[PDB]
């Protein structure tokens, strides 16, 4: 009956421009509406909304609808849902200035106000599951955004706490879809800026009851969010972010370390498919390694970052072109800068990490080479990587014969460093004699030297000979005099090596190869006996 009555009122004609008549009039209709609230009321307004919408003029009906929800959140359901259904239908296109929505955005921008506001978002969340009726989308994602956008920071933070389930549509689904709509239609990312602290960090202590009972959510769905936040977050902010998660109470996280590591997994995984926001080239070092060290440099907060590196280095997938250099270069830099005291710890955490746990293989050490190149001269860090080196070699000695390929790599692969490889191979040989395996090293040299010596005499091929001569030429120079005795004994008890050197001596096709070959030879002669 009553819908039919207000059909010709000033309810459907533009709001009187007078503020006083605007207010007095709206105050009158909100009480007329609210007088009923019968069983029929949802069914009643439903007929009223579909019949009267949409129009393009601004009307006083928007403001009565918007206010009635505010003064009677109990019946926000009966008011918003008819609009929700038409938004799903396509009857209503959603524009932030489309006129049912113009005012619901406006009431949100006072405890009465908060609850009404809350329930509006709590309703729109549940109906926001994806539909297809040109991708399939979430129909009410953008409206949630503009309401959440035009709102105090206090409720945004509490929306994401409620939505993700920190304390019907997928909770993870909406947060991602409303954070994207802001990025999609607006050109900024402020909702994802409040959402990432909202998930990782506990409620503030000042909010006590909530704080005491809250749990870190499942971080698997919000893997893009963290990538997008970390793609933009100033480096100081992420170290604020990480520490907060690191020094949180245990009721928050089963194992905060498992979750700090889990976060890393997801940005790395989302790095392969994320579009529009690219992580920095030092993102592993910048947002993590920079911070994780300083924690050690600066009470018990330092103690927990130490558990992360043991975690980081007991799962060596961080090392898994330029990302590797930067990742490796970064590991080197966090070592140097922080101080002698922390280096000794970092290095002893590393040792405890590598089973001195993961197995040890030459393939494990290929990445640490790129770290070791950047290390300085004689530091304990260099000693530590060389100590883990010996550990690797000891272990391989203990069928597939990874050893035979290893020596090929240091000798010739350029993985790199003739300086290192001379030093590295020296260690390699010294371990084999301790334990056969020494024949392997003895055997490879002749094979490489003689095959390359034959190829040259009969661009890349000449380049490798030079390197092998220098590696061997230097093995004499750097039990340093002792390995020297072995090489000279190796060369002149085999007639094949004997010949190959001689032709290399006399090769002028390449200037530097025969300057080099001559010197190695004379070094063989003296250390022969």
């Amino acid at each position: 009956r009553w819908i039919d009555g207000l059909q010709f009122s000033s309810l459907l004609w533009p709001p009187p421009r007078d503020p006083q008549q605007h207010k007095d009039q709206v105050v009158a209709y909100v009480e007329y509406f609210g007088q009923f609230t019968s069983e029929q009321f949802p069914d009643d307004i439903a007929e009223l909304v579909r019949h009267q919408y949409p129009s393009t003029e601004k009307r006083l009906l928007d403001d009565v609808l918007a206010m009635f929800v505010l003064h009677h959140p109990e019946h926000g359901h009966a008011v918003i849902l008819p609009i929700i259904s038409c938004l799903i239908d396509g009857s209503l296109v959603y524009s932030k200035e489309a006129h049912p929505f113009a005012s619901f955005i406006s009431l949100v921008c006072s405890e009465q106000w908060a609850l009404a506001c809350g329930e509006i978002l709590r309703i729109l969340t549940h109906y926001n599951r994806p539909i297809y009726k040109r991708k399939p989308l979430r129909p009410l994602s953008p409206w949630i955004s503009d309401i959440l956008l035009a709102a105090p920071l206090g409720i945004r933070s509490d929306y994401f706490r409620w939505c993700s389930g920190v304390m019907v549509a997928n909770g993870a689904g909406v947060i991602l879809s409303v954070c994207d709509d802001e990025v999609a239609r607006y050109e900024t990312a402020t909702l994802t800026a409040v959402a990432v602290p909202a998930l990782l960090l506990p409620p503030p202590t000042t909010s006590l009851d909530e704080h005491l009972v809250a749990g870190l959510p499942a971080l698997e769905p919000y893997a893009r969010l963290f990538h997008r936040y970390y793609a933009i977050a100033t480096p100081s902010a992420t170290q604020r972010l990480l520490l907060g998660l690191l020094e949180a109470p245990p009721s928050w996280a089963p194992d905060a370390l498992d979750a700090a590591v889990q976060l890393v997994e997801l940005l790395r995984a989302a790095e392969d498919y994320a579009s529009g926001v690219r992580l920095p080239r030092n993102w592993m070092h910048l947002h993590f390694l920079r911070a994780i060290g300083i924690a050690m440099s600066m009470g018990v907060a330092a103690d927990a970052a130490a558990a992360l590196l043991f975690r980081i280095l007991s799962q060596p997938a961080l090392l898994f072109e330029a990302t590797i250099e930067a990742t490796a270069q970064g590991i080197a830099s966090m070592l140097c800068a922080h101080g002698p005291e922390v280096e000794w710890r970092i290095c002893t955490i590393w040792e405890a990490a590598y089973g001195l746990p993961p197995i040890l293989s030459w393939n494990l050490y290929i990445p640490l080479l790129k770290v070791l190149e950047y290390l300085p001269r004689g530091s304990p860090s260099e000693a530590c990587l060389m100590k883990i080196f010996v550990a690797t070699v000891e272990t391989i000695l203990s069928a597939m014969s990874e050893l035979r390929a290893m020596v090929h790599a240091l000798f010739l692969e350029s993985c790199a460093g003739v300086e290192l490889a001379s030093r590295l191979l020296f260690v390699v040989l010294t371990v084999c004699v301790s334990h056969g395996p020494v024949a392997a090293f003895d055997s490879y040299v002749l094979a490489a030297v003689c095959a390359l010596a034959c190829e040259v005499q009969l661009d890349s091929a000449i380049s490798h000979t030079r390197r092998i001569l220098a590696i061997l030429e230097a093995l004499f120079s750097l039990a340093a005099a002792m390995v020297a005795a072995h090489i000279s004994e190796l060369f002149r008890r085999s007639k094949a090596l004997t010949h190959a050197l001689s032709g290399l001596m006399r090769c002028k096709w390449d200037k530097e190869i025969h300057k080099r070959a001559s010197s190695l030879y004379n070094l063989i002669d003296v250390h022969s006996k």
Binding site: E413, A447, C454
Partner: protein, 107 residues
């Protein structure tokens, strides 16, 4: 352009130790995958590669004699080539410690 390869005849099935740069670039098999493996694999077997010519190698390999012959071998791409291999036993005291294969690929 000759590709080179070496085997340690002192081990079982003569596993590879050295791979020439051109071999790495004309077989797709960089050194790391093939070292410790014998080169029995370049033909893999596959029915159409001549069964006799492969057996003539292994017989020739035992007594330690040079073998020159020609099979078709293919990159892991599946794209096939053929080369004339020269297998050169090397010895000193005089036990065959090493082998050297000098193969000249031709598609």
């Amino acid at each position: 352009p000759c590709g080179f390869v070496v085997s340690d005849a002192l081990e079982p099935d003569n596993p590879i130790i050295y791979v020439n740069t051109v071999f790495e670039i004309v077989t797709g098999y960089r050194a790391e995958e093939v070292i410790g493996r014998n080169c029995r694999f370049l033909q893999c077997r596959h029915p159409m590669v001549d069964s006799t010519i492969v057996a003539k190698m292994r017989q020739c390999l035992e007594n330690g004699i040079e073998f020159q012959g020609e099979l078709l071998n293919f990159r892991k791409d599946g794209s096939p080539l053929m080369n004339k291999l020269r297998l050169v036993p090397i010895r000193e005291e005089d036990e065959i410690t090493h082998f050297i294969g000098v193969l000249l690929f031709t598609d």
